[PDB]
Amino acid sequence: KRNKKMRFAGVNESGAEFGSDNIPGVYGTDYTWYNTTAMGEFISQGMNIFRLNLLMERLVPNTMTGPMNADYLGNLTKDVNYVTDKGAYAMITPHNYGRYYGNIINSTSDFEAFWKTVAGAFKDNDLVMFDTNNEYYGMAGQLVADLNQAAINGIRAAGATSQYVNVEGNSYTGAWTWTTAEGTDGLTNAQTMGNLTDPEDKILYHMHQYLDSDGSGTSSTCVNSTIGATRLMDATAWLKSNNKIAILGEYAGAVNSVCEEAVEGMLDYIDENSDVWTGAIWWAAGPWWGDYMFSVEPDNGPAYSTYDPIIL
Ligand SMILES: *[C@@H]1O[C@H](CO)[C@@H](O)[C@H](O)[C@H]1NC(C)=O
Ligand SMILES: *[C@@H]1O[C@H](CO)[C@@H](O)[C@H](O)[C@H]1NC(C)=O
Ligand SMILES: *[C@@H]1O[C@H](CO)[C@@H](O)[C@H](O)[C@H]1NC(C)=O
Numbered sequence: 001k002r003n004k005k006m007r008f009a010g011v012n013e014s015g016a017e018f019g020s021d022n023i024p025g026v027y028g029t030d031y032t033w034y035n036t037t038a039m040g041e042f043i044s045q046g047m048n049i050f051r052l053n054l055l056m057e058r059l060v061p062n063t064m065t066g067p068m069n070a071d072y073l074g075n076l077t078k079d080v081n082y083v084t085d086k087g088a089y090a091m092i093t094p095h096n097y098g099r100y101y102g103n104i105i106n107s108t109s110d111f112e113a114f115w116k117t118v119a120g121a122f123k124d125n126d127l128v129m130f131d132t133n134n135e136y137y138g139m140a141g142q143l144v145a146d147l148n149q150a151a152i153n154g155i156r157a158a159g160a161t162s163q164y165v166n167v168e169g170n171s172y173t174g175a176w177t178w179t180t181a182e183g184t185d186g187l188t189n190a191q192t193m194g195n196l197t198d199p200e201d202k203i204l205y206h207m208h209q210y211l212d213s214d215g216s217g218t219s220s221t222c223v224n225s226t227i228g229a230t231r232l233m234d235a236t237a238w239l240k241s242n243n244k245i246a247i248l249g250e251y252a253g254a255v256n257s258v259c260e261e262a263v264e265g266m267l268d269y270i271d272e273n274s275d276v277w278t279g280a281i282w283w284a285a286g287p288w289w290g291d292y293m294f295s296v297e298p299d300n301g302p303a304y305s306t307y308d309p310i311i312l
Pocket of ligand 1: 035037038041287297298299
């Protein structure tokens with residue numbers, strides 16, 4: 001019900017980043033790519049954005065300054081092209097939590113090199129979005145901002161000038177903790193991330209929101225009937241104040257009455273405040289979820305029949 005009131009409505013595709021113990025890992029054992037048929041169904045239903053998750057170390061092995069692995073990049077491009085050739089947006093998401101081979105990415109120059117490399121492969125695709133990194137955590141707030149800034153600079157330096165760059169905060173880029181959670185340097189996302197600059201002026205602030213008590217997305221129990229919209233409120237104020245726009249890049253509820261009402265209430269809030277929220281992206285689709293309580297993968301997603309119409 002809630003899509004044509006949003007610039008971007010769609011689903012995460014999760015699976016190509018799985019099994020991160022094993023890098024490079026092996027297709028079919030540790031990770032997989034996406035089901036173009038299922039993505040095609042979502043597109044023909046009216047969804048227009050897919051957040052394609054991947055692992056940095058598989059796309060660019062050894063060092064962040066190295067060349068790409070052509071087979072992994074090949075499959076990324078195949079899934080991206082299926083989506084963008086049909087007019088939907090493909091967001092490229094390194095699902096790495098600010099960490100490269102386990103270690104916090106401390107070098108902004110390594111990060112800019114990585115992003116200049118990945119962006120060069122897609123610089124002429126106007127339907128591609130770049131997502132600097134999924135859910136920075138346990139780091140200094142200033143380094144996370146500086147890493148995000150290094151990514152924008154890398155992306156534009158490669159000549160990828162038409163694409164929106166999704167910048168993510170520290171502390172799992174949670175919306176509800178945007179003004180409160182502090183990094184190891186004592187600074188919040190509100191305190192560090194407003195400074196980000198882009199010569200092409202296409203920065204989308206990329207936040208996540210879950211509805212259980214600790215916001216982990218771990219429990220099928222949603223706090224209460226309005227916990228979704230209420231947790232967006234502080235971040236919405238912040239966005240209007242500093243004249244920024246955002247997208248809710250991850251969200252989900254379980255299949256129960258309270259989670260359902262809380263999810264639609266949140267998506268209603270986003271429509272009410274579409275001056276700063278450009279849309280929302282469900283977590284998650286992808287073929288290797290089985291009975292995962294948030295899986296909206298059409299053929300076996302337990303959340304699909306319930307929340308696919310809500311998104312739509
Ligand atoms: C791919 O997606 C289609 C549409 O949802 C589904 O019917 C099919 O079973 C899926 N294939 C695999 C291998 O999961
Ligand atoms: C890419 O996808 C093909 C299936 O089309 C698979 O055979 C291959 O192993 C995959 N390779 C990588 C690196 O993902
Ligand atoms: C749900 O819990 C939050 C957390 O305190 C609270 O702010 C909100 O008002 C609650 N909603 C209802 C309907 O009780």
